[PDB]
Amino acid sequence: SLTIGERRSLVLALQSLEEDSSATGFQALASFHAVPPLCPYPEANQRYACCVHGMATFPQWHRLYTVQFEDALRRRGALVGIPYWDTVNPQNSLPAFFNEPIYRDPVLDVDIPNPWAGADIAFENTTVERDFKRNRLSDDGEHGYDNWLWKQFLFALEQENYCDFEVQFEIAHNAIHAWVGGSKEHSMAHLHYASYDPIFLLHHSSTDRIYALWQELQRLRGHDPNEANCALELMREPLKPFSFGAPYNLDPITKEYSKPEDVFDYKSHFNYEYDTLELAGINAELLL
């Protein structure tokens, strides 16, 4: 449902980000997410990546990552926050907004190669390739909306405990990664090349939206929407590399919200809000 003006704003912003080579650029973001790994302590001999995968801090880290992207994009100049691509409904065919490599700019009466079609990696000079399985999109189930991940998300959205949420949330998160990566390792299917793919943003925005939905899903049941009781041993430290200041975590907002506890009050801490706290054409008020 995005408009032509929004498409123009997004495409110009992405074209801008995909050309500079400063400390705030697409290559820089790739560096933050993955290889070269400079985590947690850069001077340590061992090399590790900051992509915390396999614990309770995964949603918080990725939400803060999307917050950084939102701030950078709105600094670049855009009229809406980065949209989300929802895959819960069985789409008849892949939307062409990023599929079409050539985007027609009507204001300048020209055509531009779409930066959302893909990109290239800096320190290897090889273009990341996009793979698809239209069979995965066709996967709908007997009821049509009872898709493969529909039941999984339903099973995810009722755990009263918090620490048993992420255990299937991670598998749901990597489900789309598998469904889109394809055979090639230089694709979404590998951690080392994840921020080189624009659809990364769309999928992780959708994941953040689902987490936001759970935020009031538990609230209707009447508990703490900012509870991390069963992860104290891991919440004691700020998320990396956002714990640093210069020269990597340049944004002061990220620097001063580098703590993991305060990231939960996002509605009043980041002035960004998904219009429909909703899942698959039906709101949670009867999903309960």
Partner 1 sequence: TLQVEQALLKHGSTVALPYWDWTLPISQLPSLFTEQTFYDAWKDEVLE
Partner 2 sequence: WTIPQLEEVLKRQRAQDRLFAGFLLHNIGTSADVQLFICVATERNCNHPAGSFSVLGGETEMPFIFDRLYKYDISDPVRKLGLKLDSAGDIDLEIKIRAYNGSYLESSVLRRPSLIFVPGEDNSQDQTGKTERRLIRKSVTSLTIGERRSLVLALQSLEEDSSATGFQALASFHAVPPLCPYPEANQRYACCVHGMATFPQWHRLYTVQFEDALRRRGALVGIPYWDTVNPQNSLPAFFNEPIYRDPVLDVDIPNPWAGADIAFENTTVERDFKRNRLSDDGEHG
Partner 3 sequence: SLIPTPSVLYEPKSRVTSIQELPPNRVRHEISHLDARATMSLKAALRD
Q: Which residues bind partner 3 (CB under 8 A)?
A: 246-247, 250-252, 286
- 245 contacts partner 2 (rule: CB under 8 A): no
- 23 contacts a copy of itself (rule: CB under 8 A): no
Measure the CA–CA gap between 239 and 52, rounded to whole angstroms.
9
Which member of 36, 101, 113, 281 binds a copy of itself (CB under 8 A)? 281
Shortest CB 247 distance to partner 3, Å: 8
Span interacting with a copy of itself, options 27-35, 89-97, 241-249, 273-281, rule CB under 8 A: 273-281
Which member of 89, 130, 132, 207 binds partner 2 (CB under 8 A)? 89
List the single partner that 250 binds among partner 1, partner 3, a copy of itself, none, CB under 5 to 8 Å by kind.
partner 3
- 243 contacts partner 1 (rule: CB under 8 A): no
Q: Nearest to residue 157, comparing CAs of 203, 220, 202, 87?
A: 220
- In the shown chain, the binding pattern of residues 48 to 87 toward partner 2, with x for contact by CB under 8 A and - for none, equals ----------------------------------------
Number of residues that bind partner 1 (CB under 8 A): 15
Q: Label residue 80 left, alpha or beta by phi (over 0 means left) and psi (-120 to 50 means alpha).
A: beta
User: Binding to a copy of itself (CB under 8 A): which residues in 55-94?
Assistant: 79-80
